[PDB]
Amino acid sequence: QRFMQFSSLEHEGEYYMTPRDFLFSVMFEQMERKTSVKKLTKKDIEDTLSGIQTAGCGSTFFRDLGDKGLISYTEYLFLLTILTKPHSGFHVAFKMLDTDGNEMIEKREFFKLQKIISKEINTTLQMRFFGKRGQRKLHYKEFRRFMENLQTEIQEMEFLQFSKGLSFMRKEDFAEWLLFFTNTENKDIYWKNVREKLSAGESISLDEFKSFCHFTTHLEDFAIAMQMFSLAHRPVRLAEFKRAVKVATGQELSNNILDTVFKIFDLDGDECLSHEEFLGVLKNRMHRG
Amino acid sequence: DRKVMEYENRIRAYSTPDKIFRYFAVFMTPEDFVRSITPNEKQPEHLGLDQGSIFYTLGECGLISFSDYIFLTTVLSTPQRNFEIAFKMFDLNGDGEVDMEEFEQVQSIIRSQTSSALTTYFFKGKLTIKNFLEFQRKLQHDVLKLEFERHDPVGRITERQFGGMLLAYSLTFQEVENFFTFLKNINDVDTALSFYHMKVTMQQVARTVAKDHVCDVVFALFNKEFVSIMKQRL
């Protein structure tokens, strides 16, 4: 919540961050910079329109924007809530904020929808959702296609950054990615198994990593699916894990990913998954701090 | 006078299903079963230590025996999503259809969260959850009807007591079952009120999140705390 760390623009004491800064805010715990905070010029606010005019509507919006954009602190919290909170509690504010007819939220209610969750000038998000002057309404469908595109963006650039630029990330690389935020007591054990008990190499793809990421972002059901076994003590073996991923998310998971997950969280289990451990790591992965 | 009421509630909450059956009962009746389910309703002085509705389609017009009681209570107390998963985790392609062995495995894992003439109906074959969830919804609709079908139908009017089914634990009947249909998918009716927070503020939530008549009998009692007892009521 001290997003001041990355904000490079200032205006009369209000600090704003460009899309580049917002991306550094999620891929970098810190960096060697001092951010050189500069007064907001009469070009940056124009560069906002410039950026959204040349940027693309897909997975690449925040990246094509580069520095041509603006993000306000409340909108930064809004975007972090998009990344961090599950895909089940945003359709409750649209229908509640657009009762006239179907769910379309006006520009004046976007500030409300932000002051609700996790709570001067127009920024990239306003200009993209409601147009250059506010004449457009934010359909819930377009906003869902936006939410998951931002998610896909962070997935792709984390893929490349942990794969160190190779087309395929290693199983040891996927292990690095999964454990990147876990700092708990068993931090050592997890890293023991990565190095002592894991068949190295073997070509995890970007589509497969996207599969695991979508599974992480649809894990609410996997919890109670797994909170069955914990109660009425009953084990969770490789077939149980496969079927539970299926019911929670409706998708196969490549055998590299499954082998990695088990070889990391078969804590003294003998082909049995320490699953509360695994869910703990997965929830460390969701909120980055 | 009322020491036995509070004692019976004590049985209804902290006692074994064996005891909750041996007191509230030799299978019970649809009138009896709701007594164990409904707190603050006494059984007669000749009650003690063995002292077309859904029920008919379990035995033969009212029969509710230990096995039926055990399994039938775990269907009004379990939510929707909690059932499907147990169904999808033991089927053998993972679509939601279970058979006698798999549905035997499902109740073991579903009942353990706590501290028979019907095997023929559901199945030999295999049963899906699209249909099972209907069995649950029917069980509820029928038991709710009976519970509020005797309280004073005189056909509801009651007013002053209707609050009391709201505080069972913790103008018609169709208006009531709709207050309980609104009332049940409630989690989002907490987040809607919590966004509206951070009395026709909600009468649209009943039509936008739950999807004016009864809205008056409730606001005269206490929102945002309303929700707590309502949720902890099932």
Residue numbers in the entry:
A (entry chain B): 88 to 206, 229 to 398
B (entry chain A): 108 to 132, 145 to 170, 192 to 255, 276 to 283, 288 to 318, 320 to 335, 359 to 386, 393 to 405, ...
Passage from the reporting paper:
Mitochondrial calcium uptake proteins 1 and 2 (MICU1 and MICU2) mediate mitochondrial Ca2+ influx via the mitochondrial calcium uniporter (MCU). Its molecular action for Ca2+ uptake is tightly controlled by the MICU1–MICU2 heterodimer, which comprises Ca2+ sensing proteins which act as gatekeepers at low [Ca2+] or facilitators at high [Ca2+]. Intriguingly, humans have three MICU paralogs (MICU1, MICU2 and MICU3), as well as an alternative splicing variant (MICU1.1) depending on the tissues, and human MICU1 and MICU2 generally assemble as a heterodimer and regulate Ca2+ uptake of the MCU complex in most tissues. In particular, it has been reported that MICU2 functions as a gatekeeper of the MCU for suppressing the cellular damage caused by excessive mitochondrial Ca2+ influx.
Four MICU1–MICU2 heterodimers were observed per asymmetric unit (ASU). The heterodimers were formed by a face-to-face (F–F) interface similar to other MICU homodimer structures [Figs. 1(a) and 1(b)]. Unlike MICU homodimer structures, the MICU1–MICU2 heterodimer comprised two interfaces, interfaces 1 and 2, as a result of the asymmetry of the heterodimer. Therefore, the interfaces of the MICU1–MICU2 heterodimer contained a rigid interface 1 and a variable interface 2. Compared with the homodimers in MICU1 and MICU2, only structural differences in the interloop (L6) of MICU1 EF-hand 1 were observed in interface 1 comprising MICU1 EF-hand 1 and MICU2 EF-hand 3. The primary interactions between MICU1 and MICU2 were two salt bridges involving the highly conserved side chains of Arg221(MICU1)–Asp330(MICU2) and Asp231(MICU1)–Arg352(MICU2) [Figs. 3(a), S4 and S5]. In contrast, the other salt bridge, Asp231(MICU1)–Arg352(MICU2), has never been observed in other MICU homodimer structures. Notably, the Asp231(MICU1) was located on the interloop (L6) of EF-hand 1 participating in the Ca2+ coordination, indicating that Ca2+ binding induces structural changes directly on interface 1. The tight interaction in the apo state of MICU1–MICU2 might hinder the conformational changes required for Ca2+ binding, resulting in a lower Ca2+ binding affinity in the MICU1–MICU2 heterodimer compared with that of the MICU1 homodimer.
